């Protein structure tokens, strides 16, 4: 629909997906989708189209007001989504809007209360990192967008590889696991009987902007270890040279594999195709 640009139905299924993600309690992804909805709005006053005027409740809803409501909801989501950096980010513009357009200082006070709570949450506690796996779909029986495709999955905080592999097999019949983990199979680039392979990959460090030298505490960095990421690498053991008995470091040659996907975890989807 976005390709076809018919925005209203686009919003409709966007809300559908929001329902789905809430059912899954994937607060972050629901927040992102609802944000894509909110992104269409503006801080103007005139409600330009009733297309954005959805079916949930139907009256005037100036774009300003609806945008406010959406931002409040997304803030709540991120709050229970335990992702307070984006929460603070959005809180900043929301406070801007309150103080420069509507001048309701009560909203300022509540929002700043929440922002202080967010900063406290960032500094005080800690959060587990989700393991990231690479999924290579191969064969022909796979769906069109799945055949001979490779995805990266934002697994749970403590997904041992084979647990996630089991979950993926639950997603599929023909649950057979390949063993040449690195290279694909040319026969299976056309064969039926869908073939797959999974393995953990390394979340390549992001670039926290304006953070390159300041002696910042770890917490923000550990947050950047897993979140807001787009690069992923996987080391490749290889023997190259003589296999002398006492030594192996005369042959180690790592053929690392860097993976870039079009979007940045976390996203609307817990996975994404490698780009």
């Amino acid at each position: 629909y976005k390709e076809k640009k018919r925005e209203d139905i686009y919003i409709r299924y966007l809300y559908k997906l929001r329902d789905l993600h809430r059912d899954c309690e994937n607060y972050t992804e629901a927040a992102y989708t609802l944000l894509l909805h909110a992104e269409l709005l503006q801080w103007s006053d005139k409600p330009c189209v009733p297309h954005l005027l959805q079916r949930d409740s139907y009256y005037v809803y100036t774009q300003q007001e609806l945008k406010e409501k959406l931002y409040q909801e997304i803030i709540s989501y991120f709050d229970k989504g335990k992702m307070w950096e984006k929460a603070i980010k959005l809180s900043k513009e929301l406070a801007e809007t309150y103080e420069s357009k509507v001048f309701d200082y009560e909203g300022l006070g509540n929002l700043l209360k929440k922002r202080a709570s967010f900063y406290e949450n960032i500094i005080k506690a800690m959060r587990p990192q989700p393991e990231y796996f690479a999924v290579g779909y191969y064969g022909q029986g796979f769906p069109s967008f799945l055949r001979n495709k490779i995805f990266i999955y934002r697994g749970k905080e403590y997904e041992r590889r084979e647990d996630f592999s089991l979950r993926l097999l639950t997603q599929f019949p023909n649950a057979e696991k390949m063993t040449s983990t690195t290279p694909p199979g040319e026969d299976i680039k056309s064969s039926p009987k869908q073939y797959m392979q999974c393995f953990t990959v390394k979340p390549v460090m992001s670039l926290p902007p304006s953070y390159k030298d300041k002696p910042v505490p770890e917490q923000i960095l550990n947050y950047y270890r897993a979140n807001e990421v787009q690069q992923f690498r996987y080391s490749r053991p290889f023997r190259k040279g003589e296999k002398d008995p006492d030594n192996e470091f005369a042959t180690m040659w790592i053929e690392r594999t860097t993976y870039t996907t079009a979007y940045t975890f976390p996203g609307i989807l817990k996975w994404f195709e490698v780009k």
């Binding site: 587990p128 393991e131 905080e157 403590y158 041992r160 590889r161 084979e162 063993t179 983990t181 393995f199 953990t200 080391s235 053991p237 192996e248 470091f249 180690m252 790592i254």
Partner: protein
């Protein structure tokens, strides 16, 4: 949040370090990258809550018997190890490893673990052991040894296949739990 001490010993002919590093790395089977340093650590959830973990990679030859026991104190569990395909390892463990381990820490939940679980049924390895007059020892006598110690568990796993390896370590963690 918490951590667990867990030592691992064994003869050097089995490369238990390969198993440990493969597990901690979560890598593909037979695709672990061996480091240069020992004493690996990890952070896993087994039930309820995630726990920190620390694996004492102890060299197994006889000389380091002066330095190895100094790390034994206040170890929550110890994992005794061998090779399922090495009768010599059985001699060493039932004769040296197991006795001295029980001596140093008579008070510790213990699990015996096999190795080269695939090679237990590797026909070429079995025929080599026969022509070398060694026995590809099977489970039931391993179970008998486990009863001899009455270890809280006994398991068999492999590195090239990682079978039960997760089960091995989950049992190890839940031994305290």
């Amino acid at each position: 949040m918490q951590a667990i001490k867990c030592v691992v010993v064994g003869d050097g002919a089995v490369a238990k370090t390969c198993l440990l590093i493969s597990y901690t790395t979560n890598a593909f089977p037979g695709e672990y990258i061996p480091t240069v340093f020992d004493n690996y650590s990890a952070n896993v959830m087994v039930d309820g809550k995630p726990v920190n973990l620390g694996l004492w990679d102890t060299a197994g030859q006889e000389d380091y018997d002066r330095l190895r026991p100094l790390s034994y104190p206040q170890t929550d569990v110890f994992l005794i190890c061998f090779s399922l395909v090495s009768p010599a390892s059985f001699e060493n463990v039932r004769a040296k490893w197991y006795p001295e381990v029980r001596h140093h820490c008579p008070n510790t939940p213990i699990i015996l673990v096999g190795t080269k679980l695939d090679l237990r049924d590797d026909k070429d390895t079995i025929e080599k052991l026969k022509e070398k007059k060694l026995t590809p020892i099977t489970y039931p006598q391993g179970l008998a040894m486990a009863k001899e110690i009455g270890a809280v568990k006994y398991l068999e796993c492999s590195a090239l296949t990682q079978r039960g390896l997760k089960t091995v370590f989950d049992e190890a963690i839940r031994a305290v739990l």
